[PDB]
Amino acid sequence: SAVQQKLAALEKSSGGRLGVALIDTADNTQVLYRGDERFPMCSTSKVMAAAAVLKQSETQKQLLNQPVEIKPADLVNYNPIAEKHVNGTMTLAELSAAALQYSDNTAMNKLIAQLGGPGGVTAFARAIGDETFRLDRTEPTLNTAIPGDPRDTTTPRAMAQTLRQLTLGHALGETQRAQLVTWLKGNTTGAASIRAGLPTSWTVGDKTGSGDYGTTNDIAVIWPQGRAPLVLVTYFTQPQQNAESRRDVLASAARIIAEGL
Numbered sequence: 610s611a612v613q614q615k616l617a618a619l620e621k622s623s624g625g626r627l628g629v630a631l632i633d634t635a636d637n638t639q640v641l642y643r644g645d646e647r648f649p650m651c652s653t654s655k656v657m658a659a660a661a662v663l664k665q666s667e668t669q670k671q672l673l674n675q676p677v678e679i680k681p682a683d684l685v686n687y688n689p690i691a692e693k694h695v696n697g698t699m700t701l702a703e704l705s706a707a708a709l710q711y712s713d714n715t716a717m718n719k720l721i722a723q724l725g726g727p728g729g730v731t732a733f734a735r736a737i738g739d740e741t742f743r744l745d746r747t748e749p750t751l752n753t754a755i756p757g758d759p760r761d762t763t764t765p766r767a768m769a770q771t772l773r774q775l776t777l778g779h780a781l782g783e784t785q786r787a788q789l790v791t792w793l794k795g796n797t798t799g800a801a802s803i804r805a806g807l808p809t810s811w812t813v814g815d816k817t818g819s820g821d822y823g824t825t826n827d828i829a830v831i832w833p834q835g836r837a838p839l840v841l842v843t844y845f846t847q848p849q850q851n852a853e854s855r856r857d858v859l860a861s862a863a864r865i866i867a868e869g870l
């Protein structure tokens with residue numbers, strides 16, 4: 610189709626490898642570009658960890674208010690929010706928000722610990738029907754994004770389906786889903802990524818990711834004003850380990866998708 614030709618051209622112009630999946634919930638139609646190839650998730654994995662904790666809170670009703678101590682040894686490479694609470698506590702809700710809205714890596718590691726390790730996050734994916742997602746490592750090493758390495762990867766198609774289920778479907782309880790949506794809509798790191806390729810009037814909730822090999826990712830739910838929502842996953846990675854981030858590619862891919870509607 611037109612859109613796949615334009616995405617391929619965008620990819621060729623970028624020098625990297627682009628993966629896109631769009632679900633239009635109006636007719637449950639799908640647009641895929643490298644939709645079944647694996648890509649390093651980097652911080653887009655934080656959505657799954659937060660959702661797993663939300664799922665736990667359906668039974669442990671007070672779980673999100675549980676305080677978790679932030680110690681100096683907990684700090685890793687990128688901890689904008691946790692740093693503000695060293696030698697103090699954050700609740701699991703605050704950690705989930707920090708992981709999602711600021712991409713805080715310490716917060717992510719606390720979420721992983723709450724779930725019993727990366728295998729606990731992966732287990733949640735399996736439990737909601739995602740056979741593709743795999744989380745193998747903690748922060749920061751899950752961002753190594755080595756070409757061909759299956760660790761800490763998913764495919765665009767899988768992640769789009771899973772994001773749809775978590776935010777628009779009923780993989781989570783009603784209060785939990787609403788909370789996740791609220792968190793994603795309040796993301797602070799996304800302005801140059803999918804959001805930048807979309808009409809300013811559309812509401813977006815997204816989670817970015819970035820890693821080595823110039824890996825530049827964003828996953829979003831999109832509420833166009835007067836129109837069924839869309840789920841859009843854009844993954845991008847490059848052949849050079851030290852490549853620079855290319856958020857513009859994700860913006861351009863979103864723009865191309867939006868044109869075709």
Ligand SMILES: *[B@@]1([O])O[C][C]([C][O])O1
Nearest residue numbers: 651652687712818819
């Ligand atoms: B994710 O990908 O978003 C930022 C942090 C940097 O390590 O991880």
